[PDB]
Amino acid sequence: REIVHIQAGQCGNQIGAKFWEVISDEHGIDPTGSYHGDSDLQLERINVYYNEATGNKYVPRAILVDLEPGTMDSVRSGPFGQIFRPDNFVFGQSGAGNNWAKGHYTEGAELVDSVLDVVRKESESCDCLQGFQLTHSLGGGTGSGMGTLLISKIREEYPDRIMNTFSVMPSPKVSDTVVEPYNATLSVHQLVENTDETYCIDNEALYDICFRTLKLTTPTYGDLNHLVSATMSGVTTCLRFPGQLNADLRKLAVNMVPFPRLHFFMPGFAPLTSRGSQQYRALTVPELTQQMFDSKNMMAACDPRHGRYLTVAAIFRGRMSMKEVDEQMLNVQNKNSSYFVEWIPNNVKTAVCDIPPRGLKMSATFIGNSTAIQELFKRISEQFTAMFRRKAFLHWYTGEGMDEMEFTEAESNMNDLVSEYQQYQDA
Amino acid sequence: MEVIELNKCTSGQSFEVILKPPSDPSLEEIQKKLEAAEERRKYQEAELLKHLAE
Amino acid sequence: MRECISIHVGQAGVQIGNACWELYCLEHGIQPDGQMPSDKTIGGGDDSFNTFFSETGAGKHVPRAVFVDLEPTVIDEVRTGTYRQLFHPEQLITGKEDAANNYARGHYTIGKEIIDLVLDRIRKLADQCTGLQGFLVFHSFGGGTGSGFTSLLMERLSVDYGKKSKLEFSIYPAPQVSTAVVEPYNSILTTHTTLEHSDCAFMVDNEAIYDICRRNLDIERPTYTNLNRLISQIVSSITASLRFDGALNVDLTEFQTNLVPYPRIHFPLATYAPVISAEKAYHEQLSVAEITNACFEPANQMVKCDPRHGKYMACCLLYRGDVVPKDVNAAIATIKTKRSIQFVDWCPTGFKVGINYQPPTVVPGGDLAKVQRAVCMLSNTTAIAEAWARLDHKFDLMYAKRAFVHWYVGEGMEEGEFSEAREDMAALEKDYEEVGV
Amino acid sequence: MYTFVVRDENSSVYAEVSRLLLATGQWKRLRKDNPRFNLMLGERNRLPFGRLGHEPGLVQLVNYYRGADKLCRKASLVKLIKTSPELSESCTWFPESYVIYPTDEREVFLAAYNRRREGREGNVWIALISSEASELLDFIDEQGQVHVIQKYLEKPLLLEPGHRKFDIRSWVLVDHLYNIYLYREGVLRTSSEPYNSANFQDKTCHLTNHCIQKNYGRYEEGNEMFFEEFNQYLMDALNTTLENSILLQIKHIIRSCLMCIEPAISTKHLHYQSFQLFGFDFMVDEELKVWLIEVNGAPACAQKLYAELCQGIVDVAISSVFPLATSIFIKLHH
Numbered sequence A: 001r002e003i004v005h006i007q008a009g010q011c012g013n014q015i016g017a018k019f020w021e022v023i024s025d026e027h028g029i030d031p032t033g034s035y036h037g038d039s040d041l042q043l044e045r046i047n048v049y050y051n052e053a054t055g056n057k058y059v060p061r062a063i064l065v066d067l068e069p070g071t072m073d074s075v076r077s078g079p080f081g082q083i084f085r086p087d088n089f090v091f092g093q094s095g096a097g098n099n100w101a102k103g104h105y106t107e108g109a110e111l112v113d114s115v116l117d118v119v120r121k122e123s124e125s126c127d128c129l130q131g132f133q134l135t136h137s138l139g140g141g142t143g144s145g146m147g148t149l150l151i152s153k154i155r156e157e158y159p160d161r162i163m164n165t166f167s168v169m170p171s172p173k174v175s176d177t178v179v180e181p182y183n184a185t186l187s188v189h190q191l192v193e194n195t196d197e198t199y200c201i202d203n204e205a206l207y208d209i210c211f212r213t214l215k216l217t218t219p220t221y222g223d224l225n226h227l228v229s230a231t232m233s234g235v236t237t238c239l240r241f242p243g244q245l246n247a248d249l250r251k252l253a254v255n256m257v258p259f260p261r262l263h264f265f266m267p268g269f270a271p272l273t274s275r276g277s278q279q280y281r282a283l284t285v286p287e288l289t290q291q292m293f294d295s296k297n298m299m300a301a302c303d304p305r306h307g308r309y310l311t312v313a314a315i316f317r318g319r320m321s322m323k324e325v326d327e328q329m330l331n332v333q334n335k336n337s338s339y340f341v342e343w344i345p346n347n348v349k350t351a352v353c354d355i356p357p358r359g360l361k362m363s364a365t366f367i368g369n370s371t372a373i374q375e376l377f378k379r380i381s382e383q384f385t386a387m388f389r390r391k392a393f394l395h396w397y398t399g400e401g402m403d404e405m406e407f408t409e410a411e412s413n414m415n416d417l418v419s420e421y422q423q424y425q426d427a
Numbered sequence B: 001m002e003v004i005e006l007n008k009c010t011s012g013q014s015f016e017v018i019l020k021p022p023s024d025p026s027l028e029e030i031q032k033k034l035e036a037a038e039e040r041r042k043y044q045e046a047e048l049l050k051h052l053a054e
Numbered sequence C: 001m002r003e004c005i006s007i008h009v010g011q012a013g014v015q016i017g018n019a020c021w022e023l024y025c026l027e028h029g030i031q032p033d034g035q036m037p038s039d040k041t042i043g044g045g046d047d048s049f050n051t052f053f054s055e056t057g058a059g060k061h062v063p064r065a066v067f068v069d070l071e072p073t074v075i076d077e078v079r080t081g082t083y084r085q086l087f088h089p090e091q092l093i094t095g096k097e098d099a100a101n102n103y104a105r106g107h108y109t110i111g112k113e114i115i116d117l118v119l120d121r122i123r124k125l126a127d128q129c130t131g132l133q134g135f136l137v138f139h140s141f142g143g144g145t146g147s148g149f150t151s152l153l154m155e156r157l158s159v160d161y162g163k164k165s166k167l168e169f170s171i172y173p174a175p176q177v178s179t180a181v182v183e184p185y186n187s188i189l190t191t192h193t194t195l196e197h198s199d200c201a202f203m204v205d206n207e208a209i210y211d212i213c214r215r216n217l218d219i220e221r222p223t224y225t226n227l228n229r230l231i232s233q234i235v236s237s238i239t240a241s242l243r244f245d246g247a248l249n250v251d252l253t254e255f256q257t258n259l260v261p262y263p264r265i266h267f268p269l270a271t272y273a274p275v276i277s278a279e280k281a282y283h284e285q286l287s288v289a290e291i292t293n294a295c296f297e298p299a300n301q302m303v304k305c306d307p308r309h310g311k312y313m314a315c316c317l318l319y320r321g322d323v324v325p326k327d328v329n330a331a332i333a334t335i336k337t338k339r340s341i342q343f344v345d346w347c348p349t350g351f352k353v354g355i356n357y358q359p360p361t362v363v364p365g366g367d368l369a370k371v372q373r374a375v376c377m378l379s380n381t382t383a384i385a386e387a388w389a390r391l392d393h394k395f396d397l398m399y400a401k402r403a404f405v406h407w408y409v410g411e412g413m414e415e416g417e418f419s420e421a422r423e424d425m426a427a428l429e430k431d432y433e434e435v436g437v
Numbered sequence D: 001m002y003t004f005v006v007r008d009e010n011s012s013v014y015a016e017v018s019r020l021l022l023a024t025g026q027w028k029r030l031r032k033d034n035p036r037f038n039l040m041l042g043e044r045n046r047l048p049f050g051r052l053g054h055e056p057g058l059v060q061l062v063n064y065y066r067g068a069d070k071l072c073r074k075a076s077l078v079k080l081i082k083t084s085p086e087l088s089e090s091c092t093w094f095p096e097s098y099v100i101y102p103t104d105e106r107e108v109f110l111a112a113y114n115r116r117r118e119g120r121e122g123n124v125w126i127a128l129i130s131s132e133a134s135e136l137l138d139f140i141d142e143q144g145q146v147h148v149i150q151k152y153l154e155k156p157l158l159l160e161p162g163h164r165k166f167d168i169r170s171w172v173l174v175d176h177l178y179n180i181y182l183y184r185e186g187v188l189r190t191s192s193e194p195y196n197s198a199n200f201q202d203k204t205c206h207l208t209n210h211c212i213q214k215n216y217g218r219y220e221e222g223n224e225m226f227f228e229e230f231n232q233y234l235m236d237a238l239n240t241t242l243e244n245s246i247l248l249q250i251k252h253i254i255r256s257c258l259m260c261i262e263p264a265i266s267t268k269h270l271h272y273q274s275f276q277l278f279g280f281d282f283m284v285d286e287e288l289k290v291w292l293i294e295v296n297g298a299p300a301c302a303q304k305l306y307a308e309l310c311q312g313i314v315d316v317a318i319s320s321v322f323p324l325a326t327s328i329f330i331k332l333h334h
Ligand SMILES: Nc1nc2c(ncn2[C@@H]2O[C@H](COP(=O)(O)OP(=O)(O)OP(=O)(O)O)[C@@H](O)[C@H]2O)c(=O)[nH]1
Pocket: A246, C009, C010, C011, C012, C013, C015, C016, C069, C070, C098, C099, C100, C101, C102, C106, C140, C141, C142, C143, C144, C145, C146, C147, C171, C173, C174, C177, C178, C179, C180, C183, C206, C224, C225, C227, C228, C231
């Protein structure tokens, strides 16, 4: 069950590149593309993300997309730069200028067909393609505009395949331009319709974690991406390694998404660590469980106590007492059963992987479909309305052929998504 | 109390003890049901592709 | 001699099928390569064990069985397992993508594109039968394949084999070993569709098996291997009468006769004893009275419930090992005066006993210890309806909000089938009430 | 930190228990349908015992014994006593009773009535109270439901001053280990106006329920004499104690009744556990011989005794299972 990876824009390619370099180490794949591991657990499901090639080298089933070559050139010169299939580098030259309209309608429309040709060539090699995963930001133009454009066209050509996304949310705490709420609201409108699963990676959360918890005075995008790549490695563990779960992108959707539009997940991770700073003391199972459920460990800046969990998936990694984990996970649901909906029996599920991530002897990844996620979209909505009520910076979009109506439509649907989440919070 | 119909063999034996006395769809019906659901899938997929065409 | 075909659907059915057929081989002295030295009738014969095994001129004894899964990983381990030579490639059918824990996807979507192939491979075996009695169908309630494709298959077999009986070995869903949040949906859906197509169904609650492995085998976190090797013993006890010389439950029709007076109420409660750990250094062998008394302990039942607060319609005791009728009658007489065993007014209060002098075979290196005598009680008690109640409640909780329903509708299923299925279960729950109280 | 649920609001007993549990600060009340509970203060009817003990990682407990209705139903109580060898027919402490189905144990009841009709014996019975069988055989049929005719004790023990009738109420608590705990404090639900043995259907001096009686509060506050006063009365008027003359018989009936149905309702090896508070109603004749009237599975308490009892329930029936971070009960040994 192969997955086709796509990474669009500056952010998408940078978190995408780190994602591959992380799991490549976990599967014993070196930058050359050669396997040098000690366990065969690493290879049993390596085909989900990697293609087997000449000399039995493993090539990532990844497609790198951008409207400017700047960031993709950095990837190619990066650590695991040469592992990628060079034909899967599809890029323009004009950029998107952090404009959703340029990525979705003008600049991106000119390049999108080239990308889909690569998507097709990769899919035809799949024994049985299960779906796509996309890495991108929502605050920019390419990953945001062209990313959602790609999603729309991928759904057209592969309507029976699962669409998964790692969508990075914009925040004033980590901002490139003021028009990020515009691009984000427009993108969310697309994600609600054309994805089955979306990991909400909030930059506001990633900043706070770096500042408050990790005590990093002035965090960079590199610091932020340590958290992303750690989370991405965690939420894909069940896909990359064999398990009781028999996990794929569809089973995840069926079990996590009780209602199709409400498919925006809160990722979490424990232990929170900074780059370079290695742990010496391992976390006890009670500590992993407590932390992974704490708001301070959530990659989406939302208070889970302000809502209810529809579903939860917790992935423990490393060698540990699976009994103790079950005792702690059952303790979780029994200590605060009020924050779990009573109308979905046994909505919290646990999985284990013997292989831990690099630098940690054990860890815990959290995937929650909470109704508290509305706080995220409400935040974007307020920032959106603040500008939109005065039609500020809108000329950047109308100059690309967009009409005000389309903004109002995107706004309304996101507000609907909020109310929809509020609906089941009072059930 | 009452043991009845005792039957012994080389592999074993069986009996019965009483303590107290007392006081489909057709083939095409199926295939139409399956095809009816398939048409509902194609309609759903058509409404999608039509919406995407817009 | 009349032949029986075993059908293993989904991961649960296949892996349990492996456990059972592994155990069958050890009991009949059949080797992994299919050679059975004790069978002096080379290339054929109409012995009791031929009910489950066909013979080739080369002296190979192959299971009258078919393995089907919508996804190849599980059956591929049978293709490359220790009993790979035992099976014929035509018997091991595999799809390319599973039902994703979705009944509708297994039944309607993917079920439609493989049902004809499966029935053709089943017909392949049926043609090798002198007089086929029927089928033994192993599956899960919670899986998309085990639930979805099973019900579809059970429908077609009733069309292609109307006169043939069909027995079920079904795995009831348990959170401790669940794989999907929607298993209550899949269970209700497959029960409703299969109910009129099943003559006798042996339900096994994974909760019960999980706790028995923890309580009696000291296995802190039972794996599927642990559960199945225990389930295989129960299945073996039930099917022993079909594979050995005897006069009780010699065919599939007799199962319905001796355990199922009312057609719809065809879910006998199974209770097995004793379950002793192999790693138990010192063990005092239990007597006929002790193991028989254990058959009325809820902690030994394949489904946790309280037979005291119900009524029996039938009860069969299946012994294996050093047992004689006298010790059995003595046990029953004692137990009756100390336990609440109420039969329905229109039934005789009695027990159909079956003994096989050969003690229960244990898998070498397994978790079970060798015992001098064991027993499996098959009692059709209304108390098993407690399992339907639990399950129907979990169904109601989710369906009230129509949670996850869109995944089923998206596969071409109608939302009405949820209510029609739940209504049939409501009727079933009441049927148990009229008989029980 | 434990959790519980409430599914019977009209119950005054566990309403106090739920209060006490919350007061410990180690028990959290959940919503009615929240399955992740440690304790269940369930409803009186249609209690779902089938859904108990199936929550992994939760030791579950309920304040009712499944099957205990056999004892707490008049029609079932008689059948239970008549069919159980432990009790059976020659039960000395249970009045002569007969299950009588309306428009069965009729034809056998008439045989009893006639022989006692002939022999000039005391021949009053009660479903209400009459000395003619035909009069209220027409009564059980004109109301519809099942009723039990029972031999009316024509010579009851009568309290002086007043020449008044009474019936004793004992509160018994059976824990998860089936330890039978008799609450040391009972109560005498007396009559206020003298009992007479001629006019029988003036139901104020024959039936001694708190309802009908509400000359109220004349002799004792609220028609409720407690053991201290009743014991003192027996010592002064009859030269005996409550322990000897009555309580030995009461402890005997309570034990005999519960040991009889133990194998049917016991949760010793079950996947869920049960406890239950019972209310045994006794009757004393002039010869100080105690008769069992009925058992109630959902009894209320006396206002004076609510605090002490309800706190007792938490100690031995709840905290015994769910421990936290001189005893008021007489343990009936068996
Ligand atoms: N006792 C036992 N139960 C099993 C086993 N394997 C799976 N199950 C149960 O089966 C349920 C899920 O059904 P599966 O058999 O795994 O899935 P499937 O039939 O292959 O259907 P899909 O994979 O969804 O297409 C879960 O509740 C498991 O507890 C097993 O080996 N032994």
